[PDB]
A paper describes a structure:
We therefore set out to characterize two previously unstudied proteins from the shipworm symbiont [name] that were initially identified by the presence of carbohydrate binding domains appended to uncharacterized domains with probable redox functions. One of these was TERTU_3803, which contained both a CBM10 and a CBM2 domain attached to a range of distinct modules (via flexible linkers) that did not bare any sequence similarity with catalytic domains typically found within carbohydrate-active enzymes. Using a ‘module walking’ approach, we searched for other genes coding for these X-domains. This led to the identification of [name], which lacks CBMs but contains predicted X122, X183 and X132 domains. Taken together, these sequence analyses suggested that TERTU_3803 and [name] could have a role to play in cellulose metabolism, and furthermore that role is likely to be a redox one given the presence of cytochrome domains within their linear amino acid sequences.
[name], TtX183B and TtX183C, which all derive from [name], were expressed and purified from the E. coli periplasm following co-expression with the cytochrome maturation machinery encoded on the pEC86 plasmid. All three proteins underwent crystal trials but only [name] and TtX183B formed diffracting crystals. The structure for [name] was determined via single-wavelength anomalous dispersion from the anomalous signal generated by the haem iron to a resolution of 1.4 Å. The resulting model was subsequently used to determine the structure of TtX183B via molecular replacement to 1.8 Å resolution. The polypeptide chain in each of [name] and TtX183B fold around the haem to produce a tertiary structure dominated by α-helices, as expected for small c-type cytochromes [Fig. 2(a)]. To examine the structural similarities within our TtX183 domain structures, we compared [name] with TtX183B and found that the structures superposed with one another with an r.m.s.d. of 1.12 Å over 59 Cα positions. In the structures of [name] and TtX183B, the haem propionate groups are highly solvent exposed where in CjX183 a loop was found to interact with these groups. This is likely to provide an easier exit route for electrons when O2 is present, explaining the apparent lack of stability of the reduced state for the TtX183s compared with CjX183.
Numbering used by the authors: 7 to 85
The structure:
């Protein structure tokens, strides 16, 4: 059971891709401003994503997805 993976696939991958590189120019995820700090990544997700409808993903959802992405997307933290 990997709820963060499942939630990311259901609510995020449509735009951000299976590996986080979805969208123009390599995507918004790898190296993002808050992507080095679990709590700030989760907070940004909670506040703003999915785009235009953040309530689709509850607080727990945002935490689980942030964990999934930090654990599975190489190069997510800013260098
Ligand atoms: C589903 C739950 C998610 C998660 C975890 C993320 N997104 Fe998105 N996202 C989209 C666009 C166009 C941007 C650029 C911002 C803008 O100009 O409005 C983003 C940005 C992000 C970030 C980076 C934020 C930062 O701190 O700079 C992160 C961490 C992020 N997203 C995560 C577009 C979309 C979608 C398009 C329809 C969907 C769906 C999502 N995002 C969903 C999610
Ligand atoms: Cl997970
Ligand atoms: Cl991808
Ligand atoms: Cl795009």
């Amino acid at each position: 059971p990997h709820p963060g993976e499942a939630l990311y696939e259901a609510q995020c991958a449509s735009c951000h891709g299976k590996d986080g590189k979805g969208g123009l120019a390599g995507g918004e995820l790898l190296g993002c401003d808050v992507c080095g700090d679990f709590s700030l990544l989760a907070l940004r997700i909670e506040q703003t994503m999915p785009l235009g409808n953040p309530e689709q993903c509850d607080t727990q959802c945002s935490s689980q997805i942030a964990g999934y992405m930090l654990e599975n997307f190489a190069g997510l933290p800013p260098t």
